[PDB]
Each structure stands twice: as structure tokens, then as C-alpha cells.
Write a protein that binds this ligand. Structure first.
Ligand SMILES: C[S@@+](CC[C@H](N)C(=O)[O-])C[C@H]1O[C@@H](n2cnc3c(N)ncnc32)[C@H](O)[C@@H]1O
Length: 266
């Protein structure tokens, strides 16, 4: 019954999973009660028997390791509320930095047409679309991805400017390749031997982590375009062997996190 007593008991159950256990419980409780984080303030109570059990289930669920954000059915990325669920990779905060680089690149060059390969939750393409006049073409090998991205776009009023199709790389948009000014991706960059609550396709790029990159730069002619993709810490020197002329950016941590091929001409 006692709501805040409950919240303490659960915090402890998540100490080996998260440093911020209390916040996770507050979130879970809020969700289960179908309420806003910020209304959790009455200084007393507010939870019924069946609600109590549900919360305990979900704390159990999370206790094992199951990502928090599958349970919430939601994730903030760029201060926008993105839907997620099993089968969709959950946005990481580092990818924000990528979207912010992409947006300045747009302003600088007045870019109007942008692609997002492996859109996932739609988190990069929708953001770029939401915070600029660009239109975005997005792909993903996964059907869940594409349903979810279409919903997220629609959920942020950019359905008129964010188009998503199932397929690999830009095969479903051969018709638009010409016009694409900027290709964006947070692809799978993890080794096969760096070993999931999230889709395997989303994480790994073979025993190297580079399987995506090799295919991309082999298959596609990037002349006249700009490429900008997130990358694993370690792969800078090997990536320089896949593509030359490429630039590589440090992130907030001061670790290389993005490759940047600018082939946009004057
Ligand atoms: C690392 S997750 C990133 C999701 C999203 N870009 C983000 O950062 O939030 C990679 C995503 O790419 C998709 N994917 C992997 N390889 C792909 C490929 N060759 N073509 C299109 N999509 C791909 C997966 O479906 C997955 O959702």
C-alpha cells in the first residue's frame, strides 16, 4: 500500500544493474500508474493491489537486465519522446552529438536532402527532420524498425518530410541517390566477439565491427555528398584503411566517435 515505502524496497533490487536505481523505480511506478513523473508528489500514498504486483513484475524484469526503456515504451532523444519496444535499438545519448553535427552541417551548406541508414527508432532522421527544413529518407533491414519510425515521425509531425522504407543501405532509394546531399548513420560497429537485450543486427559488424563500412564505401559512390557516421572508439586507424580523406571527430568524452567524409564540392 504505502507508495514511498514501495519505492525504497525496489531501489535496492536494481543496485547491481544501475547506479540510479531510485529514479528507475520512480519511472516504472509512474508508467504503471499511468501518470507523469512530476505528479508522483503526494506526501503519503496512492497505489492499488494489482498495480503493486505489476510494479514488482517490472522491477523483476529490469532486475535481470532487460533495458529500462523497453518497459517504459519510450525514450528521450534530443528532448523528443521516441517510442521503442523489443526489436528496436534504443537511442544512446552519444548519437545526439551526431544529430547536432548534422544540423550545423545543414545550416552551413543549406542542405535540403538527407538520408539515415538504419534508422532504428527513427531517432536520427526524425530529429533532423524536426529541427530543420531537410527531408529525410530512411532505411532499415527490420520491419519493426520501419513501423516504429513511421509512428515516431507521425508522432512529431514530420511524416510529410521523413520517409522510411525496408531494405539495406540505400537499395530502397536507388531512385534518390543522386539527390542525397548527406548520408547519416549510427550503424552497428561492435565486434562479433564483444559478447543482448537488443537486436543483434543493431550491434555487431562481424569479427571486425566494420562489415557495414566496407560494404557501404565499396558499394556507394560518395562524390559530391557528405557522410557522417558514428563509430566505435577503437576503429579510427582501420577505418582510415577503408576510406581515405576521412576526418574523425572526438566527442564530449574526448574519444573518437564520428567519421566525416566531406565530398561536397564547390
Ligand atoms: C546501432 S542501431 C542504431 C539505431 C539508430 N540509428 C540510433 O542511433 O538510435 C543500428 C540500426 O541499423 C539497422 N541496420 C543495420 N545494418 C543495416 C543496413 N545495412 N541497412 C539498413 N539498416 C541497417 C538495424 O535495424 C538497427 O536498428
Amino acid at each position: 500500500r504505502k507508495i514511498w515505502s514501495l519505492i525504497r524496497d525496489c531501489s535496492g533490487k536494481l543496485e547491481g544493474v544501475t547506479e540510479t536505481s531510485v529514479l528507475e523505480v520512480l519511472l516504472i511506478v509512474s508508467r504503471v500508474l499511468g501518470i507523469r513523473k512530476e505528479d508522483l508528489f503526494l506526501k503519503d500514498l496512492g497505489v492499488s493491489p494489482t498495480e503493486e504486483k505489476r510494479i514488482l513484475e517490472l522491477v523483476e524484469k529490469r532486475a535481470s537486465g532487460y533495458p529500462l526503456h523497453y518497459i517504459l515504451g519510450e525514450k528521450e532523444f534530443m528532448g523528443l519522446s521516441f517510442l521503442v519496444e523489443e526489436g528496436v535499438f534504443v537511442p544512446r545519448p552519444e548519437t545526439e552529438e551526431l544529430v547536432e553535427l548534422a544540423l550545423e552541417l545543414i545550416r552551413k551548406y543549406g542542405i535540403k536532402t538527407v538520408a539515415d541508414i538504419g534508422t532504428g527508432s527513427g531517432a536520427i532522421g526524425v530529429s533532423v527532420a524536426k529541427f530543420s527544413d531537410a527531408i529525410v529518407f530512411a532505411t532499415d533491414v527490420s520491419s519493426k524498425a520501419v513501423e516504429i519510425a513511421r509512428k515516431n515521425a507521425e508522432r512529431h509531425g514530420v511524416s510529410d518530410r521523413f520517409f522510411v522504407r525496408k531494405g539495406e543501405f540505400l537499395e530502397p532509394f536507388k531512385e534518390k541517390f543522386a539527390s542525397i546531399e548527406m548520408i547519416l548513420s549510427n550503424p552497428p560497429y561492435v565486434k562479433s566477439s564483444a559478447h543482448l537485450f537488443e537486436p543483434p543486427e543493431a550491434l555487431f559488424g562481424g569479427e571486425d565491427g566494420l562489415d557495414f563500412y566496407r560494404e557501404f564505401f565499396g558499394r556507394y559512390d560518395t562524390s559530391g555528398k557528405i557522410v557522417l557516421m558514428e563509430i566505435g572508439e577503437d576503429q579510427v586507424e582501420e577505418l582510415k584503411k577503408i576510406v581515405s580523406d576521412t576526418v574523425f571527430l572526438k566527442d564530449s568524452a574526448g574519444k573518437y566517435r564520428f567519421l566525416l567524409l566531406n565530398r561536397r564540392s564547390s
